[PDB]
Amino acid sequence: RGMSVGFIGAGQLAFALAKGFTAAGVLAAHKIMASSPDMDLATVSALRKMGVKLTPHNKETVQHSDVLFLAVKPHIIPFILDEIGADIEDRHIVVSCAAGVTISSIEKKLSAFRPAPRVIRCMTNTPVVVREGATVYATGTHAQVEDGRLMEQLLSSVGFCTEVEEDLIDAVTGLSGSGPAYAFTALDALADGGVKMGLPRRLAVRLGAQALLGAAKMLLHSEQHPGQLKDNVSSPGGATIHALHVLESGGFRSLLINAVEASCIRTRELQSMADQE
C-alpha cells in the first residue's frame, strides 16, 4: 500500500508489467521506476508517456523501489548485482525474471553485500499487459512467507500466478514464456489462410484471435481434456475433422513439442553457460 516498485531492466516485459500493474490499478504509474540504459524509444518513451519514473541510473531505481524487478538480459544480471548489491536494503524484495538465471547464482553472490538477501525467481510473458499474462515463481531461501504472498498477490492481479519449485521454471518458460509468440505466429498464419479464402485481413486475423481466446477459455473453465473438446466440435461430417486431418498430416503437434523443447533446452544452456564463462 505504501509499496513502490522498480525495474532495473526495462524493455517490453518491464513496460508490459508496468502497464498491467497500473492497469490492475494496483500501483500508481508514477509510483514505478525503471532504469533506461540508452533508452529504446518505443519501450522507454512508452513508459515515459505512460507516467512512470524512468532514470538512466539503475541505482536510484534501487532506492525508489520497495520491490525490485530485474528486467535485464540474463548475461547482464551479473554486471548489475555487483553494482547495486551495496544498495540492497533489508526492506525490498528482489524479483528476478531474467530467464535461465538461477536464484542461487544471485543469492550466493548478492550475499557478498547483505547477509541474507530476500529474493524470488520470476517468469511471466507480455500478455500480462492486458492481464492474462501467465506467471509462476519460486521463493528464495531468505524467503519469508509474507513475500511469497505479496508476490503471488501482486502478480496474480495481472494474470495467472502460482508457486513452482525452481527446477521447473525452465520447462515453464518454453511454454508460457514463449508460447504467446507461437500464438502470434499461428494467428498471423490463420489470417493469411482466411484471406486465401476471401476474408479480409482486419476481419480474418481477428476472427482467428477470437477463436483462440475462445478455445482457451473453454479448456480452462472445465476438465474435459483437449482431445475431448476436440471430438465435441468435429461432426462426423467434416470441414473440421478434415482440417484436422491436414494439420495432423503435417506433424502440427510434433512442431509444437519441438518448440517447447527448443525454448526450454535453450534456456537450460543460457544459464548453464554463465555458470562458468
Ligand X SMILES: NC(=O)c1ccc[n+]([C@@H]2O[C@H](COP(=O)([O-])OP(=O)(O)OC[C@H]3O[C@@H](n4cnc5c(N)ncnc54)[C@H](OP(=O)(O)O)[C@@H]3O)[C@@H](O)[C@H]2O)c1
Under the rule (CB under 6 A), what is the footprint of ligand X?
Answer: 131-132, 156-157, 159-160, 220, 222-223
The backbone torsions φ and ψ at residue 35, rounded to the nearest 5 degrees and listed phi first, read -80, 130
Quick one: residue 276, left, alpha or beta (phi over 0 = left, psi -120 to 50 = alpha)? alpha
Q: Which is nearer to ligand X, 227 or 237 (CB)?
A: 227
Identify the helix (H) or strand (E) that includes residue 193: helix 179-195
Cell of residue 44, nine digits: 522507454
CB of 244 to ligand X, least distance (A): 21
Residues 39, 58: Cα–Cα separation, whole Å: 12
Cell of residue 109, nine digits: 553472490
Ligand-binding annotation for 232, yes or no, is yes
Type of residue at 29: A
Q: Which is nearer to ligand X, 55 or 156 (CB)?
A: 156
Ligand-binding annotation for 8, yes or no, is yes
Give the residue from 63, 80, 60 showing the smallest Cα distance to 72: 80
CB of 246 to ligand X, least distance (A): 27
CB of 159 to ligand X, least distance (A): 6
Helix/strand/coil for 164: coil
Ligand-binding annotation for 99, yes or no, is yes
Ligand-binding annotation for 73, yes or no, is yes
Cell of residue 77, nine digits: 544480471
What lies within 8 Å, CB to CB, of 155 at 6+ separation is: 122, 124, 128, 133, 135, 137, 161
Q: Tabulate helix, strand, coil % of the chain (nearest 5).
A: 55, 10, 35
CB of 69 to ligand X, least distance (A): 18
Ligand-binding annotation for 18, yes or no, is no
Q: Which is nearer to ligand X, 219 or 241 (CB)?
A: 219
CB of 53 to ligand X, least distance (A): 25
Q: Which is nearer to ligand X, 10 or 155 (CB)?
A: 155
Binding residues: 8-13, 36, 38, 58, 71-74, 97-99, 166, 232, 239-240
Binding residues for L-proline: 166, 239-240
Binding residues for NADP(+): 8-13, 36, 58, 71-74, 97-99
Binding residues for NADPH: 10, 12-13, 36, 38, 58, 72-73, 99, 232
